Design a protein around this ligand. Structure first.
Ligand code: HEM
Ligand code: PLM
Length: 429
């Protein structure tokens, strides 16, 4: 039987978790009960898997599929049947997957690079125009950048987050729809439908982005284009799935570089050697290999999307001993503990060492899952890593980052993980 922490009659296992800190709570219980355990709530049971062998076993696509059972079922209210919140067997999933997969390749990022630079320059100019001793809020400015980059690169819409003191009506409306996990959802649907209507009427200009892609390219298997409602769901899906996770990545990367001076010094080395022009080029961004290893290490230590869920396709066993009823038990992957599995990663799991990714043969894959698994893995992986590398390189090109308050990490979790109350100061170089 699957290990279980305790039980308190009607209360299940909930007396052992902080409802506001689910991932961290599960980390604690994992430290107590090992690579697999089950948590009983008032209504259901969750199986939390964290050992790399069991995680790899549950990652077998023949036996397990993506589950949308809990948080994602709430996100579904406004994300609908988009890539993030649709079941694999639903038709629009593989339709949109085939349609949009080439646009998210690394070669396709060559097409988005300019727009990414646009928003990056905005961030840099903001920080350069600060008055002496003004503080910057790393998560909020990173979120400004990530939301604007996704809007511009994806459907050529400028949120202009850097022209606002309070985050955009869309992002607070989205936070209200998520803190539910109707007014707001309808306003979101209409804004997206407005951009879609602007594009379908007089769609002359070669915008060459995600919306034009969904309007032009059909699914080669079915021969069909995505319908309008699903395109709306896809645009909302890109916004939610991209901006928060990628801004969390940027914030954690800035934190780790501030707390590990050697890695920052090496990053300065690489950026100065590569970033010679005022604005980076796509080729130059790819040359920033050490920065991308810094990002890989940051995602290992604090995966901004800390979990994904699976369901069993037919009755089976894990580890040779733990049974799973078919399609009834929701398996949650505890990505931080998986990323701290010493048998797969070694002993220095808590150290910030980008050099773990120095040699692409040595990285223990299937114990490194910051972007999900298999066919339901993150379609925006290359988008996110390219954008994050660009922003980090540019910030290091222009700025000296100062830990003026001696920041003490506090991992806040909403739907994603991020540093809470993270403020620094900046100087020009
Ligand atoms: C650091 C940045 C990011 C992280 C850590 C991340 C993480 C993830 C994870 C873990 C999943 C799998 C979720 C599950 O299987 O339940 C996923 C899926 C997805 N992500 Fe990302 N993501 C990031 C950036 C982005 C960006 C930039 C975009 C879009 C521009 C995006 C769009 C999506 C979509 C559409 C899916 C659904 C994939 C499918 O099953 O078809 N993500 N992401
Ligand atoms: C930063 C560390 C976070 C760790 C989260 C562990 C907190 C939960 C420990 C057991 C529950 C104790 C109180 C939680 C609230 C409650 O019981 O109503």
């Amino acid at each position: 039987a699957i290990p279980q922490p305790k039980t308190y009659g009607p209360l299940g296992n909930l007396p052992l978790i902080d409802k506001d800190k689910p991932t961290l709570s599960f980390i604690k219980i994992a430290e107590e009960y090992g690579p697999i355990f089950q948590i009983q709530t008032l209504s259901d049971t969750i199986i939390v898997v964290s050992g790399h062998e069991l995680v790899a076993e549950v990652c077998d696509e023949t036996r397990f599929d993506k589950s949308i059972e809990g948080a994602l079922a709430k996100v579904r209210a406004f994300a609908g049947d988009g890539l993030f919140t649709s079941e694999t067997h639903e038709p629009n999933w593989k339709k949109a997957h085939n349609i949009l997969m080439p646009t998210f390749s690394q070669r396709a990022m060559k097409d988005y690079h300019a727009m990414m630079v646009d928003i990056a320059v905005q961030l840099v100019q903001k920080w350069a125009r600060l008055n002496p001793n003004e503080n910057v809020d790393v998560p909020e400015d990173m979120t400004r950048l990530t939301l604007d980059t996704i809007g511009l690169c994806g459907f050529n819409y400028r949120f202009n987050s850097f022209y606002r003191e309070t985050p955009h009506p869309f992002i607070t409306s989205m936070t209200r729809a998520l803190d539910e996990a109707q007014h707001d959802i309808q306003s979101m649907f209409s804004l997206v439908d407005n951009i879609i209507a602007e594009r379908k009427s007089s769609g002359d200009q070669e915008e060459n982005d995600l919306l034009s892609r969904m309007l032009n390219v059909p699914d080669p298997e079915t021969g069909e284009k995505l319908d309008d409602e699903n395109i709306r769901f896809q645009i909302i899906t890109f916004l939610i799935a991209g901006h928060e996770t990628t801004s969390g990545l940027l914030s954690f990367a800035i934190y780790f570089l501030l707390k590990n001076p050697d890695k920052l010094k090496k990053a300065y080395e690489e950026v100065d050697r590569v970033l010679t022009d005022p604005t980076p080029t796509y080729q130059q961004v790819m040359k920033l290999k050490y920065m991308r290893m810094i990002l890989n290490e940051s995602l290992r230590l604090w995966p901004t999307a800390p979990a994904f869920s699976l369901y069993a396709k037919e009755d089976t066993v894990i580890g040779g001993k733990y049974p799973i009823k078919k399609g009834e038990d929701r398996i949650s992957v505890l990505i931080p503990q998986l990323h701290r599995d010493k048998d797969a990663w070694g002993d220095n799991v808590e150290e910030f060492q980008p050099e773990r990714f120095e040699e692409l043969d040595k990285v223990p894959h299937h114990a490194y899952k910051p972007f999900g698994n298999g066919q339901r893995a993150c379609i925006g992986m290359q988008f996110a890593l390219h954008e994050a590398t660009l922003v980090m390189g540019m910030l290091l090109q222009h700025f000296e980052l100062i830990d003026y308050q001696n920041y003490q990490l506090d991992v806040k979790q909403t739907l994603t993980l991020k540093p809470g109350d993270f403020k620094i100061r900046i100087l020009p170089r």
